[PDB]
Amino acid sequence: ASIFRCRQCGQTISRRDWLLPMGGDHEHVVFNPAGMIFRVWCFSLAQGLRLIGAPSGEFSWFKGYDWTIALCGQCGSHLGWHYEGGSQPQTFFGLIKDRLAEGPA
Numbered sequence: 543a544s545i546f547r548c549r550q551c552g553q554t555i556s557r558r559d560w561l562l563p564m565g566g567d568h569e570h571v572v573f574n575p576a577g578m579i580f581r582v583w584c585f586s587l588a589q590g591l592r593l594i595g596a597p598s599g600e601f602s603w604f605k606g607y608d609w610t611i612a613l614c615g616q617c618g619s620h621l622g623w624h625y626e627g628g629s630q631p632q633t634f635f636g637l638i639k640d641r642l643a644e645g646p647a
């Protein structure tokens with residue numbers, strides 16, 4: 543249990559080694575304006591994604607960061623968001639834990 547893959551197609555996305563404790567925790571439970579709850583895991587790094595649109599600061603769960611939607615680059619599954627424009631770190635990924643599958647490298 544050290545690699546994260548897209549639950550829908552198996553695309554390589556991230557690693558347990560790349561977990562990032564933003565505000566002292568890698569897990570953040572958050573709600574969007576449509577009331578959907580997400581268990582978000584923060585990663586320093588991810589791969590195999592496709593970032594859609596231009597960054598937005600509106601409704602950001604992380605103060606000082608703008609977000610872009612992150613799809614699975616293979617199947618188009620919505621896996622979370624890329625954050626940028628902030629400080630320490632400048633960028634990171636917030637990925638939806640239940641849309642990933644954890645397993646061996």
Ligand SMILES: Nc1cccc(SC[C@H]2CCC(=O)NC2=O)c1
Nearest residue numbers: 574575576601602603604609623
């Ligand atoms: N109106 C509307 C309907 C669905 C979603 C949204 S923004 C969705 C996410 C983006 C990432 C973030 O940090 N906060 C959010 O809330 C806005």
Ligand SMILES: [Zn+2]
Nearest residue numbers: 548551614617
């Ligand atoms: Zn996928």
